[PDB]
């Protein structure tokens, strides 16, 4: 079953406008293989990822997830972004953490220009439990059962400097891939769209 | 201790004429701050020796 897992599949989509303040939170990523937000109107289908179908037939999941953020700039769109993973569970007030407070956590920066445009972010396995239950199968919150090993805010680390004959915004695809992935305790569950 | 802390950030414009002082920032005093990770090593200590890596 490692075929539909390691191949990067689009999980989310967010742009990056030039009219934003430095340090403004763009989009958080709840770090789990269960995450997807796309759909389609022709045909009427909720777009799953190929990793979200493998792990949804299990209780527990474990593995070093590799997020691949493919920006689509020109060569001259300049600036940098911040992909700051904050571990723990799916629910902490990470929106209240300031940008310089987010410099305490380990993270990475990426120049929008350059000769490449995709950053492979290998998420560490940071959890209190050695696995993580499919709490989406259940319908109740409980301290001890959770869904994610942490969240991942895309910050505005630098502004987007560009001329007027190019675009004012650069869109970022969120690929979903992994390495050393393990799941057990099988079940059947259809996942629902994380509506952010 | 060896992890980069964003101690300052600015925005340089066109209206700043030649040799205008855009930023006047202190190095170690902005490092000694509660919102960073080195506060857990500098609050319980008083006298220190260190080298500064600016990026």
């Amino acid at each position, epitope marked *: 079953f490692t075929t539909w897992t390691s191949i990067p599949t689009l999980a989310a989509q967010f742009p990056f406008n*030039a*009219s*934003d*303040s*430095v*340090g*403004q*939170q763009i*989009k*958080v990523i709840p770090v789990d293989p269960y995450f997807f937000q796309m759909t389609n109107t022709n045909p009427d289908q909720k777009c799953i990822t190929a990793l979200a179908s493998i792990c949804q037939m299990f209780c527990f999941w474990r593995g070093d997830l590799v997020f691949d953020f493919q920006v689509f700039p020109t060569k001259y769109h300049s600036g940098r972004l911040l992909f700051c993973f904050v571990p723990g569970n799916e*629910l*902490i*007030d990470v*929106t*209240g953490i*300031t*940008l*310089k407070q987010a410099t305490t956590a380990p993270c990475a920066v990426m120049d929008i220009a350059g000769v490449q445009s995709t950053l492979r972010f290998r998420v560490p396995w940071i959890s209190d439990t050695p696995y993580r239950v499919n709490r989406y199968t259940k319908e109740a919150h409980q301290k001890g059962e959770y869904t994610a090993i942490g969240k991942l805010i895309v910050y505005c680390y630098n502004r987007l400097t560009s001329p007027s004959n190019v675009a004012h915004h650069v869109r970022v695809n969120v690929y979903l891939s992994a390495i050393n992935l393990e799941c057990f305790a099988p079940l059947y569950h259809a996942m629902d769209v994380t*509506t*952010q | 201790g060896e992890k980069f802390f*964003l101690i300052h*950030s*600015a*925005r340089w*414009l*066109t*209206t700043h004429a030649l040799f205008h002082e855009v930023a006047k920032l202190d190095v170690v005093k902005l490092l000694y701050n509660e919102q960073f990770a080195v506060q857990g090593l500098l609050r319980y200590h008083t006298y220190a020796r260190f080298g500064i890596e600016i990026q």
Partner: antibody, heavy 121, light 107 residues
Framework: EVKLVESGGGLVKPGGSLKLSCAAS????????MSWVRQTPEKRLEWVAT????????YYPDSVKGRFTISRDNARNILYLQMSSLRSGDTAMYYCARRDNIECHYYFDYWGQGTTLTVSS | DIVLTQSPAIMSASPGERVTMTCSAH?????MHWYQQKSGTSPKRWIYDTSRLADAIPQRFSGRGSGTSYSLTISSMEAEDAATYYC?????????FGGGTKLEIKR
């Protein structure tokens, strides 16, 4: 475009209760902290309430701590500012704000059109 | 707790000259944020942390000063600034604003 439409306000006797509501538009709800800014016609301004994305954290000043209640909803994306024990100190224009993050401090980006609550009997 | 003090209360200036307003406090605040309350509408994105203008206003404005004094340097006055200004802190609990700076046009 941010369309923050307040709802509420009018003629409420002092000591009464009235709940406000500010709806979000075209942008994500689980990031941007929502607030309320009171606009008195003579002086100002006093800042009253904020509950964040997770509903655990509330931040009130010395004055309106415990008398006003701000709430958020992930389903409708509409605020709920429940007010009680009003008087002439709150007879003003009410705006709803949206608080995002900068390097050291925060900022309120986009504000609404504002509704009028007159508190007298 | 802490109270912000704006020294220009009511000012009127001809279009095409330099205007500087100042918001101070009784203690030391780090960064100061500004707004513009036009008639009939609400304040929008105007000024963030120290010299960080908005991304939709013209760039003929500036903001300097640290510690006590906080100058907002206007390079060239124009006919679009007939409104009321406020200054914002982000230190301790009440998050108070300034008393109000009404800048107008001299005729």
């Amino acid at each position: 475009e941010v369309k923050l439409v307040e709802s509420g306000g009018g003629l409420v006797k002092p000591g009464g209760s009235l709940k406000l509501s500010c709806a979000a538009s075209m942008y994500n709800f689980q990031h941007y902290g929502m607030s309320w800014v009171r606009q008195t016609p003579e002086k100002r301004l006093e800042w009253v309430a904020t509950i964040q994305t997770n509903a655990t954290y509330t931040y009130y000043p010395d004055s309106v701590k415990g008398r006003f209640t701000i709430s958020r909803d992930n389903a409708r994306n509409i605020l709920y500012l429940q007010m009680s024990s009003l008087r002439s100190g709150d007879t003003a224009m009410y705006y709803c704000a949206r608080r995002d993050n900068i390097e050291c401090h925060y900022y309120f980006d986009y504000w609404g059109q504002g509704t009028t609550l007159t508190v007298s009997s | 707790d802490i109270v912000l003090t704006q020294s220009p209360a009511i000012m009127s200036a001809s279009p095409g000259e330099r205007v500087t307003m100042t918001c101070s406090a009784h203690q030391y605040v780090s960064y100061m944020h500004w707004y513009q309350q036009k008639s009939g509408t609400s304040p929008k994105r105007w000024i963030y942390d120290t010299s960080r203008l908005a991304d939709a206003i013209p760039q003929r404005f500036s903001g300097r000063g640290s510690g006590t004094s906080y100058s907002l340097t206007i390079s060239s006055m124009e006919a679009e600034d007939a409104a009321t200004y406020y200054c914002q802190q982000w230190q301790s609990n009440p998050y108070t604003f300034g008393g109000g700076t009404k800048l107008e046009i001299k005729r």
